[PDB]
Design a protein around this ligand. Structure first.
Ligand SMILES: *[C@@H]1O[C@H](CO)[C@@H](O)[C@H](O)[C@H]1NC(C)=O
Ligand SMILES: *[C@@H]1O[C@H](CO)[C@@H](O)[C@H](O)[C@H]1NC(C)=O
Ligand SMILES: *[C@@H]1O[C@H](CO)[C@@H](O)[C@H](O)[C@H]1NC(C)=O
Ligand SMILES: *[C@@H]1O[C@H](CO)[C@@H](O)[C@H](O)[C@H]1NC(C)=O
Ligand SMILES: *[C@@H]1O[C@H](CO)[C@@H](O)[C@H](O)[C@H]1NC(C)=O
Ligand SMILES: *[C@@H]1O[C@H](CO)[C@@H](O)[C@H](O)[C@H]1NC(C)=O
Ligand SMILES: *[C@@H]1O[C@H](CO)[C@@H](O)[C@H](O)[C@H]1NC(C)=O
Ligand SMILES: *[C@@H]1O[C@H](CO)[C@@H](O)[C@H](O)[C@H]1NC(C)=O
Ligand SMILES: *[C@@H]1O[C@H](CO)[C@@H](O)[C@H](O)[C@H]1NC(C)=O
Ligand SMILES: *[C@@H]1O[C@H](CO)[C@@H](O)[C@H](O)[C@H]1NC(C)=O
Ligand SMILES: *[C@@H]1O[C@H](CO)[C@@H](O)[C@H](O)[C@H]1NC(C)=O
Ligand SMILES: *[C@@H]1O[C@H](CO)[C@@H](O)[C@H](O)[C@H]1NC(C)=O
Lengths: 491, 491, 491
């Protein structure tokens, strides 16, 4: 009247943080953690402390050849990836074509060193016209102009002598060389420009064995030209020579480019400001500090990235299902201000709540380890995802799309079920921990106390604060009170 | 002599439905659900309410150029995918080659609008022979003939004047234009047919800059021709002009094709009847109503499909392990005609079975949610899987095969283990639910009853139907009978 | 004073074998099993009982054409894959190019039958010079030489008559035919060698329609040649003829190759000895007997292989957490010399340990089934992983790398978490089994014994070895001792 009591119970709090499990939707819970990165900084950033190459209104081709309307950032000796607009305004001012363009974009996507040099001075053309090679398709300061890196040679007097030019690459570094051929409209234009009616450009390195011949066709005007310029490139290894021979129609190099290539990346289509941030993962919509193993921002990423996932929320339960003084069977304790599982006693020294420190540590550690494993086991490689295929490579683009879409489906399904399965396992761990604590006590006390049915025991003897601590420590000397218990029990 | 009794037990039934778990093979179970679609309708069907294009004995090339033996469905203004036989009977009647054929098949795989028009009337050839261009390789009504969409121009009198033809595309829609070059056997045939010994075809759009030249070689007869016809195509954007100029050997357009292209699909190899069904997933062996997240019919699918899996059966447990009156420890109850877990009482008002409605709902809901999650979380995108690569693209075909085979291995393993893991979890949930119900009762009754060891309690007091309901409701007033219990207990 | 006793306990042993679980790192455990193959034999081996093709210092091209410095294993009628060194010493002695080389390597990667034959005897050149076609780029026995499979025809007297040669393929098997064109330095060399200033090679099968024309350019010396040899191949189906016609610059066939092609494989880069072993999985670093479902040796494998994984250890728990006479609550029993779970009794016939045979079998079977499922459910297809793309196919190489790196990330993550999740499930199974055994006994004995709190019961009656066996059998007749128990209990 009335006997000393110890109850087993668990933490509860004012949290409304919800969670899904394989078996129940929308379960309220004590603490939760999202494993899905949703947040970008909305800017293009260095990658591993190397600037991008931003081409505001130029294309790579425009940029390389010197489209004279390309008002771009000129000096920039190294980059990690390239940013083009979707359809750049300024491409090939004079209509034509860039042979193996997509392969050259991919090669220029990440460069360790890039330095333009002069290989063939515009001044060394003694027996041809350097400065007439000019068009109203390629306007500069209101006047007609041309690509600035490459010389459109015309006949001088009424003569176009055969050209012979070797350049030997005496630099330490691979040289990227560009040249072109002019495809004129008719045999009139051919002779008007080059005198010789039948022409060729021949180019040879140790690798290259090229003989180009102009093609006449009747073609629709583009930038008011029916002519076409067709451009070619090669990489001149650092002790080789390139050898040009031409009768006519030659768009000769002035400027080449020293390159040092140390692994690839890609070209990103984006409308964003550089931001002076560093990052290890860049997106068309912005960069990411990628601690989380999943993101849902954009598929077309460059760097060490979280796996892209079609998903709004990946939330793991970390805490508990959230809902004398009665114990566990009836609900959680707001009063358990600290600890996850534990006790409420009441004796002659008075009542209160105590944490089971030992079984609360085991569980915080377990849940923490569960969360870190799901995060830390994620293998994170460098990748560069772009669209590097032209309108005659659609079969290969469709191969790429099945692969991307394939991996998106695997990660999205697996992450979704991983969260649902481990949430069901986390809430059952908490149940299993509370019930093991009931049984820890039940098995110490045996007949020295009676199970009240609600999570509590009423003692058959006096249990002061020091006896209570021995129950919580698992050091309860049952023989020391079996005598006193037996007397109150029999009655 | 003898006391009132309540037992805890679970449903059992005549089911032989088996299931595998990570730990036990072939476990009999109360109800099961297959998550593996195995059933097709054996027919080719519309896709998203758009007909396929069935080419019974033609190839796409045959079909486009007008191989005159191609007896096909002529009118058909739009399609979602194409069906060819494996090796069609009718291809190129006159032997030769179709430039960039596989890219053109992929472009024509799904078309929003397709309308043949005449761009160059067969009648407009005033200074050349339209109607002699004919061969016994391309037989029609027993007589020698040719491709019907394209004109094989021969010299008139003994003259082949230079051809100049612009067509301007004044339609609203992109035009697909086809032309050809004849590669003859020798300089005799060349002049016999075209007079001029040295010829060219030149074709120019705003895009295209082509000059074809016939090639002589000594070639093996095919359909009794040693000649070769080589065909070319382009897409004429809706305000551009195409410009032909030819000396000879020109296979000119008569008919072109208006196309509107809204995303791609592929070409399916199949021997099946159209069936007037609609579907969202088509297979070479038949269509699928794809509610299930996995199928095992065929890899080469077009649509939103279940993931293809190498597997006979993916069966999830939904029910229970299947095997006074004794309770749970001894087996299941055929008498539990309704509900999964519950009770059998016997008192002075008589005996019977009662469901634990509350804990049976929780579990049906849980299992239902488990099954729906495993199904609903499956991300389902449109994909079109074909073999779009020729016998010089084998490296790219092998890239495609590693990717397909790679995803088949991931899904097949993951689905197999997902079923085994969640089956072990489902059967342990049912164990855990029954035992929690034993403990619900055990904890209400305490010493007012004795555990019989077999799943049952014998009461130490009179428990009529209304007391029993309070045990099942969890509203058992123990103080109301501790007195009467204590008297029968002490004795 | 003192009463008969039965305790429930579990196996323990001197094991230090550790294991990780989703929730605890470094858990000591009774027995463990690695599922990660780490061990290769360090040798190149037959694949499915078919030898590889080892090219010690040759390239495939060198090998095919007969680079006379290629001292290789000559006779070898069939192979399963090819081994080249990274950069072979001996390639094209005379500098040039092999058209569609990578596609030909992939076609020759696995051959069912390969037999060189003579199609055009070196002796049949009556009106040209067979034996002058020779260079100091292609040295043999100190003297100048050439490719041995192919004849460099020079003019005889000062004449190079037009060549006409059909070969008809009267063998049962596809023929691989090789020829070349010489691209000379200038019109002097052209006429010095071939007399005719303007030349062509024309080649025609039922498939092929080729006209090659030599290209002059000024080119850097390679092996002291500025000339270039460019080689071409085709497959002559078994009743077709190939037809050569040449004016000059013709590198004619002597030897062709009978091939029978039955599915593909790839070219492996490795520095290893053949070893006369058979295997079903080959690695650049050595072969594997692939019973395990995961390996971490090398990505570039050929055969039925374990999935490649970035991982040091995949270790599954199979045994138990490893740590009167007290039962389970206090730790494991070294004395439980045999069985996983069971009993220690002590009565008047004396004390000892007994296995619960029934519940130990269930569990060994369960764990064995868990391990076999994780291994046996692994779908294992043939694949051949190589690097089959040249320095202008980098976009397709980058597609391949994302796919490989993609699958490495999926398998590595999934295997890691599968081990951690199933380890946590295995240790909780063992807990759940021991506690069910405590409850098996507790529920048989009821009040005929008292729970000592530590895993033990003290009996309220005499329990000889035969009573004890009935407790372990689950056949304990409680009515047979309730009388004797009640007397000792009341007191
Ligand atoms: C879960 O919660 C949200 C409210 O935040 C609600 O839209 C949804 O309907 C709830 N229930 C289920 C079963 O999804
Ligand atoms: C071109 O150069 C000069 C005149 O400025 C003259 O000597 C030369 O012969 C001219 N050639 C012709 C063919 O008109
Ligand atoms: C085609 O016709 C239209 C309208 O008559 C004209 O504006 C257009 O420029 C023509 N296209 C070409 C390139 O001639
Ligand atoms: C547990 O509690 C008792 C009572 O306060 C105390 O004497 C003892 O130090 C504790 N035992 C252990 C092992 O912590
Ligand atoms: C499972 O059941 C089938 C009979 O339907 C049988 O073939 C098989 O051998 C059984 N047992 C095992 C271990 O697979
Ligand atoms: C071809 O056309 C007519 C005869 O039908 C004649 O006027 C013309 O000159 C003929 N040409 C030749 C070169 O025979
Ligand atoms: C090759 O020889 C066979 C048998 O003599 C002959 O039937 C076949 O047509 C020949 N092939 C060609 C295309 O000449
Ligand atoms: C449970 O059972 C008792 C006895 O029939 C009944 O009076 C009461 O309405 C029920 N209580 C609840 C909360 O359903
Ligand atoms: C696990 O064990 C190894 C010693 O073999 C040690 O390096 C490591 O630090 C241990 N602990 C953890 C938390 O990884
Ligand atoms: C080459 O062959 C013989 C001399 O050996 C001679 O009959 C023939 O005319 C020679 N030709 C020329 C053009 O010198
Ligand atoms: C380029 O110049 C270097 C050094 O003067 C020389 O050794 C080298 O051979 C030259 N290259 C060629 C192919 O001429
Ligand atoms: C179990 O043990 C008892 C006592 O030894 C023995 O009589 C009986 O044969 C056993 N019962 C069964 C079903 O094995």
């Amino acid at each position: 009247d009335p006997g000393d009591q110890i109850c087993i119970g668990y933490h509860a709090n004012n949290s409304t943080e919800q969670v899904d499990t394989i078996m129940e939707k929308n379960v309220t819970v004590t603490h939760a953690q999202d494993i899905l990165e949703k947040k970008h900084n909305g800017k293009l950033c260095d990658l591993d402390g190397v600037k991008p190459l931003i081409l505001r209104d130029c294309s790579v081709a425009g940029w390389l050849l010197g489209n004279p309307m390309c008002d771009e950032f000129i000096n920039v000796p190294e980059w990690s990836y390239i940013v083009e607009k979707a359809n750049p305004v300024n491409d090939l001012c004079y209509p034509g074509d860039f042979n193996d363009y997509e392969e050259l974009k991919h090669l220029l996507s990440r460069i360790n060193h890039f330095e333009k040099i002069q290989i063939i001075p515009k001044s060394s053309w003694s027996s041809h016209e350097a400065s007439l090679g000019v068009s109203s398709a390629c306007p500069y300061q209101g006047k007609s102009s041309f690509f600035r890196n490459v010389v459109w040679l015309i006949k001088k007097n009424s003569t176009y002598p055969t050209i012979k030019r070797s350049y030997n690459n005496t630099n330490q570094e691979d040289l990227l060389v560009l040249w072109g051929i002019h495809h004129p409209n008719d045999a009139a234009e051919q002779t008007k420009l080059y005198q010789n009616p039948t022409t060729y450009i021949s180019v040879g390195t140790s690798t290259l064995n090229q003989r180009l011949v102009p093609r006449i066709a009747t073609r629709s005007k583009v930038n008011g030209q029916s002519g076409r310029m067709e451009f070619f490139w090669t990489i001149l290894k650092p002790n080789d020579a390139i050898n040009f021979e031409s009768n006519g129609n030659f768009i000769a190099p002035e400027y080449a480019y020293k390159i040092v290539k140390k692994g690839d990346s890609t070209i990103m289509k984006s409308e964003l400001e550089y931001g002076n941030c560093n990052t290890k993962c860049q997106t068309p919509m912005g960069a990411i500090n990628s601690s989380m193993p999943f993101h849902n921002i954009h598929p077309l990423t460059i760097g060490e990235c979280p796996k892209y996932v079609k998903s709004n929320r990946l939330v793991l339960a970390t805490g508990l299902r959230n809902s004398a003084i009665a114990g566990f069977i009836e609900g959680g304790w707001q009063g358990m201000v600290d600890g996850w599982y534990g006790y409420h006693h009441s004796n002659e020294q008075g009542s209160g709540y105590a944490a089971d420190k030992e079984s609360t540590q085991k569980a915080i550690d377990g849940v923490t380890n569960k969360v870190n494993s799901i995060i830390d086991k994620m293998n994170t490689q460098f990748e560069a995802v772009g669209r590097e295929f032209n309108n005659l490579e659609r079969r290969i683009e469709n191969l790429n799309k099945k692969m991307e879409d394939g991996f998106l489906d695997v990660w999205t399904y697996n992450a979704e079920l991983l969260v649902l399965m481990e949430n069901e396992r986390t809430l059952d761990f908490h149940d299993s921990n509370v019930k093991n604590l009931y049984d820890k006590v039940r098995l110490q006390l045996r007949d020295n106390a009676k199970e009240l049915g609600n999570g509590c025991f009423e003692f058959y003897h006096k249990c002061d604060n020091e006896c209570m601590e021995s129950v919580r420590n698992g050091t309860y000397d049952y023989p020391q009170y079996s005598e006193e218990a037996r007397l109150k029990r029999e009655e």
